[PDB]
Paper text:
Intermediate filaments (IFs) are integral components of the cytoskeleton. They provide cells with tissue-specific mechanical properties and are involved in numerous cellular processes. Vimentin is mainly expressed in cells of mesenchymal origin, in which it assembles into extensive, dynamic and hyperelastic filament networks. The vimentin tetramer is the basic building block for subsequent formation of unit-length filaments and VIF assembly.
To this end, we polymerized VIFs in vitro from bacterially expressed and purified human vimentin, and imaged the filaments using cryo-EM. The resulting 3D structure of VIFs reached a resolution of 7.2 Å. Comprehensive power-spectrum analysis yields a helical rise of 42.5 Å and a helical twist of 73.7°. The definition and initial folds of the vimentin domains, namely the 1A–1B (residues 86–253) and 2A–2B (265–411) domains, the linker L12 (254–264) and the head (1–85) and tail domains (412–466), were based on the AlphaFold prediction of the full-length vimentin dimer. The initial folds were adapted to the cryo-EM density map by molecular dynamics flexible fitting. The cross-section view shows that VIFs comprise 40 polypeptide chains, which are partitioned into five octameric protofibrils. The frontal, straight tetrameric α-helix bundle (red region) accommodates two antiparallel 2A–2B dimers (green to red colored α-helices). The lateral, curved tetrameric α-helix bundle (blue region) accommodates two antiparallel 1A–1B dimers (blue to green colored α-helices). The N-terminal ends (NTEs) of each 1A–1B dimer position the head domains to protrude into the filament lumen, where they interact to form the luminal fiber (blue chains). The protofibrils are connected laterally by interactions of the tail domains and connected centrally by interactions of the head domains.
Author numbering:
A (entry chain 2), F (entry chain 1): 209 to 259
B (entry chain l), I (entry chain k): 53 to 104
C (entry chain z), H (entry chain y): 105 to 156
D (entry chain AJ), J (entry chain AI): 364 to 415
E (entry chain i), G (entry chain j): 260 to 311
Write the structure that this text describes.
């Protein structure tokens, strides 16, 4: 129960450790999803004189 | 127009080699750049720019 | 040409409306990540401070 | 844990540069289409105005 | 009328479709986080199975 | 090291409680981040394009 | 109709399609990374089952 | 006023440059909110929670 | 002429952190409110609703 | 288990390298989009005798 109780600690902590690196990874990828939005704003340059 | 007020940067601290064990009860940080929210703070304001 | 200068004053008054909205839109974008995400990223940080 | 997020990074980042490039490719396609329009509409405003 | 018409609303619909492409990209970063969470939880569960 | 680890099992009941409200602040952050994307889409486009 | 203008909005629908198509490839990339974590930590678990 | 339709046709072509300078300024604030939140701040936090 | 120094030195100290082998550091993780940031997010909705 | 924590911190450093270069690609995009809105604006200076 040193091994079992500290491994029951670790088997959950490694899941949250992996999920927090995956949230950091999904957020450094969501930087590229906001960069496709910034690319739309960069392409709107485009159109003609109004009235 | 000066960078680093007071000359500041993160200078190396390194102390006495204290071997404490620390059982490491995490604050997880769901704001590891919640950044989609701060691009969205710029879009809570691009929404104001288009309406204006 | 007062009829055409009235369209060209429509353009220069639409510039003045485009700037009225877009100086609000730059100010909403340069703020909204400091407001809405400006509370959610503050709980996100207080749970990291709570973790240590 | 290192490989899954360093590969999520390596794949996402080689996509984000291309995703910004493709928002900027939509902007480029709009620039050509806006030329083909501009050289005809603002290019009949030409006999008051002109194109590119 | 000096102003044409609808010409305003068509450019505003244009820049709102370019803004809706940016919203669909913002929500596709919530999709990207969701698949990065599928990865992070698969990496945790197989880690806790090898720690077991 | 088991008395440490079994008290450490009760630490994960507290840390999973804490991280479930961190993941609730991060979900609220995604709902504010989606409202900010819709604000940014309206904010970048009402000036009427290139003219 | 003195210049087509709508041809810009049809390119922004195309840039939305090309952006969403690129993010759908990144959703698949993170799912392939999830499977690479499954396979890599299964290979580590087999090296630990050999110790067990 | 054959020369004031004129200066204000030139002004709406300069104000086109102001419209792109404003849309490009929301873009270049949103691009710094993008970099500041997405990869940096959200990485900087969850890389310390993963250490705890 | 506004020469005024808007930058104040946010004064950091880190004297050399001795042997903290005293274990009496209780955990507290108290954060974040920050309800002023959700008031500012509501003032960005209100400022957009005024701009509308 | 320290190579997990260290190489995950070097993943997120390696991700922040590519994400800071994504923010430089948002800058460099705005540099060329400003430049190519200038390649519109010779033709929009032509398009009313106007934005140089």
């Amino acid at each position: 129960d040193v091994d079992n109780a500290s491994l029951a600690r670790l088997d959950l902590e490694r899941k949250v450790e992996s999920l927090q690196e995956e949230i950091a990874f999904l957020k450094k990828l969501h930087e590229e999803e906001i960069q496709e939005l910034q690319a739309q704003i960069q392409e709107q340059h485009v159109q003609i004189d109004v009235d | 127009y000066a960078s680093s007020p007071g000359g500041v940067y993160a200078t190396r601290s390194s102390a006495v080699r204290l071997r404490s064990s620390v059982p490491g009860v995490r604050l997880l940080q769901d704001s590891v750049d919640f950044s989609l929210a701060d691009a969205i703070n710029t879009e809570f304001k691009n929404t104001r720019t288009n309406e204006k | 040409v007062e009829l055409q200068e009235l369209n060209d004053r429509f353009a220069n008054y639409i510039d003045k409306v485009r700037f009225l909205e877009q100086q609000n839109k730059i100010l909403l974008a340069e703020l909204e990540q400091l407001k809405g995400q400006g509370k959610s990223r503050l709980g996100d940080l207080y749970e990291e401070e709570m973790r240590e | 844990r290192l490989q899954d997020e360093i590969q999520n990074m390596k794949e996402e980042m080689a996509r984000h540069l291309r995703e910004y490039q493709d928002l900027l490719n939509v902007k480029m396609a709009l620039d050509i289409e806006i030329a083909t329009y501009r050289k005809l509409l603002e290019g009949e405003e030409s006999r008051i105005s002109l194109p590119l | 009328v000096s102003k044409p018409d609808l010409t305003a609303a068509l450019r505003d619909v244009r820049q709102q479709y370019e803004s809706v492409a940016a919203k669909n990209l913002q929500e596709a970063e919530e999709w990207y986080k969701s698949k990065f969470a599928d990865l992070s939880e698969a990496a945790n569960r197989n880690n806790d199975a090898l720690r077991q």
